[PDB]
Amino acid sequence: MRVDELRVDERIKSTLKERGIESFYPPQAEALKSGILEGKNALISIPTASGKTLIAEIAMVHRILTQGGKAVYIVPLKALAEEKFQEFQDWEKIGLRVAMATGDYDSKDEWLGKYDIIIATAEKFDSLLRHGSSWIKDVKILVADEIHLIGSRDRGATLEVILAHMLGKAQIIGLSATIGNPEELAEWLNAELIVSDWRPVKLRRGVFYQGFVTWEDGSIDRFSSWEELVYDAIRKKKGALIFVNMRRKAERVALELSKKVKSLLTKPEIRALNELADSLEENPTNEKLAKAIRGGVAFHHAGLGRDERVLVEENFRKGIIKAVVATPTLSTPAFRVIIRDIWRYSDFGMERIPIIEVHQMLGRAGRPKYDEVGEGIIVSTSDDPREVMNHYIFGKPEKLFSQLSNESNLRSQVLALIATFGYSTVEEILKFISNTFYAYQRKDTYSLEEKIRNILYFLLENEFIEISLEDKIRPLSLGIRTAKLYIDPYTAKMFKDKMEEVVKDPNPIGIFHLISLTPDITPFNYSKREFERLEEEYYEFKDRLYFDDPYIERKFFRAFKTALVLLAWINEVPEGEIVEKYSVEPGDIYRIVETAEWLVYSLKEIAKVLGAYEIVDYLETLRVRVKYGIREELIPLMQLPLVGRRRARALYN
Secondary structure (H helix, E strand, O other): EEEHHOOOHHHHHHHHHHOOEOOOOOHHHHOOOOHHHOOOEEEEOOHHHHHHHHHHHHHHHHHHHHHHOEEEEEOOOOOOOHHHHHHOOHHHOOOOEEEEEEOOOOOOOHHHOOOOEEEEEEEHHHHHHHOOOOOHHEEEEEEEOOOOHHHHHOHHHHHHHHHHHHHHHHEEEEEEOOOOOOOHHHHHOOEEEOOOOOOOEEEEEEEEOOOOOEEEEOOEEEEOHHHHHHHHHHHOOEEEEEEEOOOHHHHHHHHHHHHHHHHHOOOOHHHHHHHHHHOOOOHHHHHHHHHHHHOOOOOOOOOOOOHHHHHHHHHHHHHOEEEEEEEOOOOOEEEEEEOOOOOOOOOOOOEOOOOHHOOOOOOOOOOOOOOEEEEEEOOOOOOOOOHHHHHOOOOOOOOOOOOOOOOHHHHHHHHHHHHOOOOHHHHHHHHHHHOOHEEEEEEEHHHHHHHHHHHHHHHHHOOOOOOOOOOOOEEHHHHHHHHHOOOOOHHHHHHHHHHHHHHOOOOHHHHHHHHHOOOOOOOOOOOOOOHHHHHHHHHHOOOOOOOOOOOOOOHHHHHHHHHHHHHHOOOOOOHHHHHHHOOOOHHHHHHHHHHHHHHHHHHHHOOOOOOOHHHHHHHHHHHHHHHOOHHHHHHHHHHHOOOOHHHHHHOOO
16 A cells, blocks of 8 residues: 555645655555444554554554544553654654643643643553543543463553553554454454554574574474574674573573674774663663673673663664664564573563564564564474474463452552542442453353452441442542552551551651551562671661561561662762662662652651641652652752753762
């Protein structure tokens, strides 16, 4: 299909041409002629390499232009939002307002009412709906990217919830990877189903086993070692992407590869890779990233700061970096994609990476511009080669299961309905359930109903809600406030129960430990080695905490380690020193800090709700200290367009 055969305003055809696009891939055309341009819902299940995002932009803009209103683009993580924001800029050339909303859960954000295209994570949008933002009624279409994450135990329930709220109120467009139950999800969505595996560049998938790669077609190719695939790819001017399961693993493998890749890097690239390694902020975690990069290979994982990760990502794109070793969470295309591990550590033991995931990983092979073929190789270190092939190259992807039973999401969601959506009867809350994907999969209805009755009891006991002998459920201040803060009802419960202790002794350690013990935060882990030190410091500072005795406990000390880290953060300990002293990386530090700000904020708000107004100012000063990791006497110099503990501290001196 030629962009000009597209029955849409010239403004869109014009913007695409400027983009170099003149025609659509067969999968794109099928999607564009399925009814999405006429408002129908649709579920697009095709390779990422086939431009799922373009089908969404076109249907969004066409939607707005033909009927005013706004378009919502829901993104998986508040990090794939800035990239969606950059690529959605060219829509402003035709007068479209593109906004990005990610955090700050406690606000209606009425300022978004003047934008046409809004990008947000599922959580952020879920809370906007709770706050009842004025403009939401103007949303005419919502696009959910990687909609298949609805099957994620963690946050899939949130995505399901907002989708359940929006179905039949706006056009819904889902973008997903291949899954086992495409038609079931499409039906629940009352959507057109577009399933395809057509891709621009041919994809050859194989398995590397003891000196050889066996491709799906049947042929065999010798390779002395899996790493040789990388080396070969690099010698051939192409690049390589290698997936691993652990951070340190990614780090060991990156440094390793780089030790033999450097002898393939012309003077320019080595010269450049050095100007590159020297630009990295200084800290342990980067020192490593440094050595590897000067060698041409880099590692990529959550333990690295946002910037570092961006620097890697783009330079791999720029091609200045020949290969990047990365973990899954937070993972451009490459000629060769190597999956070096097929077993990952879960709390359920070491398990095999899901099929849906391996496919998504192999699908990143083959750059439209530079390749006549893309190759994805799974490395079988100690698995039956044939079994690996049959399970990951010829096995149906997993079927998506509603993750609505996730007790933490459900408890927070049952209250949200009562406290911000006016549900007042169990039977009415059940009506909501009936429109969810859980209800549509006809999954165990009884068990869900009982978990909800129990949850209502929990909420009724802790005074978030109230009931009548007529059984009319109505929310109370703490209920409404909790729901609007987006925190788990249980962390609110934990704040409420300890509010007397906090006002009796307001202090950093106590608070950080308290918040780091709730469900809304993932405390730092600790090893067998340091645990010794943690115990002494604990018993040395048990007076400042708000809990009697851990025993009378793993999370307790994780939270306690976290309380110490944050404490050093507010006391301006240099990043690098914190990384060292507590064995933690700047990625987790920024993540935890950012979450602590949110959580110390929510404690202030819950304090307001419970009369403890005398600690409000303190917690407020604590919130700001946590956000920038600074002493109070610097909070003024924080205003600036940008500075931080960085210069600020020096300035003040």
